[model samples]
Target: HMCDAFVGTWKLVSSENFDDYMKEVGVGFATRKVAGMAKPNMIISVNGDVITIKSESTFKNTEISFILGQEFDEVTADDRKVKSTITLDGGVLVHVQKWDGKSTTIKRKREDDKLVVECVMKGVTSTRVYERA
Candidate 1:
């Protein structure tokens, strides 16, 4: 019987300056209410150029499949569209969904058994550590 950490939770006492990270880009919505507090899963297809990513979650997931150096239309909870790029540098998955005349960068980095997804936008920063790989 094998178990996974990503599938695993809680510390009793709470008081943290988090929450508003998503609420910022999140800006507040029912979509934010649903997924931000959810889990993870992934399916990959990258034979080079035609990189296909099908990611799923509780309310389902979204993918921005393209070449490692390609630009695609990215969406935020606000339903705004922008140009984005994806790259794997030094084993870190880097995605920069850039510009409004503004920008936001999300990095998928691995540490120990944790897959940490860190988000930064408009000088506000937040870290998301998934339980497992």
Candidate 2:
């Protein structure tokens, strides 16, 4: 199952345009600076219909849990609060986050032994890759 495919720890390997994406999402300068230098480790766990994603780093750590297709409140690492939901399409896990007239879509999928996370907002896209840890 795709859920089980994501049930593992992953370490950040590379990132593209993450700083700009963070800025687009309204992350502060200092926080974006720190986040840009940090290599975050992610732990993803799926239990039945619930999924939990924990992003850990020296700069900040955040955990978000949600049931498949159910909406919930999400507080991002940059302290942005939003309504979010996770859904599966094909083999990809898609996260839709909405807040204060802005919105973001985060797509997660497994590529061989790596996890790829793509963030999109206002036509700006950032790709972050993670390796199994």
Candidate 3:
């Protein structure tokens, strides 16, 4: 059910505390500024045992392909290298990314026709909401 629920395109509606979170994560000022101005579209799909997450924005496009519970390397839009993993817990999809001894966790869930993503890094949290597109 959770995988089925996530198989769709979601357009960003609003973001809160994202700048601060990016700053805490070491994204430079210029990139953070552009990131703040960019409204990305998230496309998620499930294919057999693999999950694909595509983030499209004016600043950059990132595609994450992974199998559940397995770790894979990723390069962030801002060019950070990380080892990423995903897991399903209840109705939530959790993504954990580790880089340079720092880690960020993002939890995504569907709530009332909206997709809510909570990103946490270095004790800072950002909440981004998206609507079905």
Candidate 4:
């Protein structure tokens, strides 16, 4: 029952400041261009305080898992390849990463009918939203 609040998956329909968001994550020129144009498919599974997410695109695939209220390791297969930890702040999940001598943080929340993810890096931040697929 603890995992009931979040389950299944959603696809990324659109985003705000997406190009720059991908850029900040160290995505290369070609990949960023493709990602901006391609729709992403996302799946989220939850079990108690643990959550697993899969973000897929034609060009790439990313999977992540973390436990709420506690920090856990995160490594991305993307360009940044950053190592990070995530914690639950209220109903939101906050991810903090360290890579290439820099740090980045991402905040995620489910509100209304959408899942919102906001990322901040190098003093710049962007938000991405997803809807049921």
Candidate 5:
């Protein structure tokens, strides 16, 4: 059986910027402000090596498809190249992105009845943890 628990569209409910993570990623002030206010909807469809991800919002939208365990270049809506690796860390999905020549770790785990997305870059971490759909 497939793991449908995480196979769905999710919205960005809340985000925490412990440090200047966006700045470290080279996100411009205007872009970061826009991104901060966006409640992006993420559609994740997993099929073997094929994984489809769509992040949509009123300000911007990003869509991509890639094979699992294969290295690929991902460009965010703001045009940042993310040389990424998709892996399973225990039961969680993890993505390590190389943005702006720096490494950023992004992770997704279900905890306390919520889906938590934690991001760490340049010692400044952020989280976009959300509840179920």
Candidate 6:
């Protein structure tokens, strides 16, 4: 797949403005507090036509598997059910999830031998940095 660049296990290095991003998405105060303090490693792999990305964390773990250019039902870490799609544009993998007319985008890319994840919700953006482990 064109998303092969992200096919590796990566450890979370840093996160910026993640709690605020979650708040914009309607996450509860208790859940948002705990989630903000948790660090998750990303395990991404592409097998044949299917790609799987797993967030391995003690607080909460979530995973998604889908073929490119297709829509699938997704239950997010926050337990929201959304229609999701992932597509590659140049070096970035753009993932979108929508529910109840609300939507969010997550962009993943490799930059300087590191994995940078950008999350967007209600105009708020959170950036998470990861390094190959």
TM-score of each: 0.68, 0.96, 0.96, 0.82, 0.87, 0.96
- What is the C-alpha local distance difference test score of candidate 6? 0.91
The local lDDT score (0 to 100) that residue 63 gets in candidate 2 is: 93
Which residue ranges in model 3 land beyond 4 Å of their true spot?
none
Superposed Cα deviation of residue 83, candidate 6 (Å): 0.6
Stretches of candidate 4 exceeding 4 Å from the true structure: 1-4, 69-73
* lDDT of every predicted structure (CA atoms): 0.58, 0.92, 0.92, 0.74, 0.76, 0.91
Across 14-112, the per-residue lDDT of candidate 6 in tens digits comes to: 999999899998889998988888889899998889999999898899989999889999998888999999988887899999999999999998999
C-alpha lDDT (0 to 100) for residue 56 of candidate 6: 89
Clash count, one per candidate: 3, 0, 0, 0, 0, 0
* Ten contiguous residues with the weakest lDDT in model 3: 1-10
Q: Give the better candidate number (1 or 6) by TM-score.
A: 6
lDDT of 3 by residue, 10-128 (tens): 99999999999999899999999998998899999988888999999898999998998999999999899999989999879999999888899999998989999999986799999
Model 1 lDDT on a 0 to 1 scale: 0.58
Pick out the ten consecutive residues of candidate 1 with the lowest summed lDDT: 1-10
Better of 1 and 3 by TM-score: 3
lDDT of 3 at 116: 98
Instruction: List, residue by residue over 23-57, the lDDT tens digit for candidate 5.
Output: 87778888888777888788878887687878789
Q: Which model, 3 or 6, shows the larger lDDT?
A: 3
User: Clashing pairs in model 6?
Assistant: none
Kindly list the per-residue Cα lDDT of model 4 for residues 3-107, writing each as its tens digit: 444466777766788778667767888877876787778788886666888888887788887765555556564556666777766767678888778787888
